Amino acid sequence: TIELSNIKENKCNGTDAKVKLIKQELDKYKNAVTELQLLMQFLGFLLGVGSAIASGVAVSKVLHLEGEVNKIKSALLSTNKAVVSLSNGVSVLTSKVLDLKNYIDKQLLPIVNKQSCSISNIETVIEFQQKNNRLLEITREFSVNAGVTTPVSTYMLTNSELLSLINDMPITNDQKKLMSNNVQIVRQQ
């Protein structure tokens, strides 16, 4: 899970270069959110036919239900790892890998409304596009793959995030040490 704030339409009149960047970035972010909303809506012949992501999709289908997010959302409000039992009975671990909401809603937008959209310090706009950058790549990868990515990139799951996920997987230390030393192959599978 990535925590997002939905940004409503900004009322910024003016063509000062500082405003032009802030508005440019806010619209760039709003497009990604809109883009991601569009997405919710010799002897080989002997082998036989699997459904590679049937398991992952089955979990993904449950998340569409009314207020399944609130189960997730409340579980991770105080920590970044929790096990949630979904409506179908499946308990699945959930992880909060990024909190972009608190920066936007409680640091950026307050400064925008305070300074009438004329940002004084250019460093806050560069801060913003860097904060904003990962979510933009995540949405690009999904936009070009119809929502299903393989291998799992470092924007989808950073190297430390994956190594931490392995520790919490229901596997032997032989399995954890195997996966931990071959993350690049793990990503490919």
Partner: antibody, heavy 123, light 112 residues
Framework: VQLQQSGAELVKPGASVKLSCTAS????????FHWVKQRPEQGLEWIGR????????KYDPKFQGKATITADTSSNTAFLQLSSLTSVDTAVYYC?????????????????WGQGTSVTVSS | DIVLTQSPASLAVSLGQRTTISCRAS??????????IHWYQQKPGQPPKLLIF???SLESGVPARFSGSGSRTDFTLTIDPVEADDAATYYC?????????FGSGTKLEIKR
């Protein structure tokens, strides 16, 4: 712009009531709405807020079950349903939003207020 | 919940003098650089009118006779000079944490 709330209400104890707040001059999809309770000679109590664009709501838990906030973008109207009323629900109920602000936040101040709906609970 | 204590509960002020109202928070109401405190004026029969947003920002259309100050748990609304129209009740409000909470109010009376 204008937020026009529905008229005064007389409610039997135990019954329910649904209050309305119709917006003119702007589209409610583009901001957030709050409901605020003010009992006579009492303070202000924030009931909750809604994002009309997707139905997302957040309540003070004190009002959970008691207060239900909904919105309808089709008629540009926000609603507050109060359920199973008792005498402590007799109060003025306000609608509110941020409009006088560059970017609307759910955490922004409440700069526009409806005129209030006066709910009286009595047999 | 964050509890906001406003004092005095009521005060009398002469025309043209400056006066201050206090609002003290239970916990800090700051995120990053900003204080999420707001001040509203309410006259009988009307909804509140926003005067100051965040800590010190004057709402558009509000006379520059109103000012706000404060940083973490201690906040001040100042009216200077006081005018006859300023007789009303003033409320502070925080939005840094859910649920949003209001102060218990300070009633300003004009002395004549």
């Amino acid at each position: 712009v204008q937020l026009q709330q529905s008229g005064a209400e007389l409610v039997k104890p135990g019954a329910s009531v649904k209050l309305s707040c119709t917006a003119s001059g702007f589209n409610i999809k583009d901001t957030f709405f709050h409901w605020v309770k003010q009992r006579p000679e009492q303070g202000l109590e924030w009931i909750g807020r809604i994002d009309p664009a997707d139905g997302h709501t957040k309540y003070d838990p004190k009002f959970q079950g008691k207060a239900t906030i909904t919105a309808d973008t089709s008629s540009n109207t926000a609603f507050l349903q109060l359920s199973s009323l008792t005498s402590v629900d007799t109060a003025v109920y306000y609608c509110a939003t941020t409009i006088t602000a560059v970017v609307p936040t759910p955490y922004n101040a409440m700069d526009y207020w409806g005129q209030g709906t006066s709910v009286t609970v009595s047999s | 919940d964050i509890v906001l204590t406003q004092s005095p509960a009521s005060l009398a002020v002469s025309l043209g003098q400056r006066t201050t109202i206090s609002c003290r928070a239970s916990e800090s109401v700051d995120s990053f650089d900003n204080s999420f405190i707001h001040w509203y004026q309410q006259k009988p029969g009307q909804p509140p009118k926003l005067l100051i947003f965040l800590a010190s920002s004057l709402e558009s259309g509000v006379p520059a006779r109103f000012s706000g100050s404060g940083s973490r748990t201690d906040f001040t609304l100042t009216i200077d000079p006081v005018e006859a129209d300023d007789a009303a009740t003033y409320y502070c409000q925080q939005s840094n944490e859910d649920p949003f909470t209001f102060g218990s109010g300070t009633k300003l009376e004009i002395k004549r």
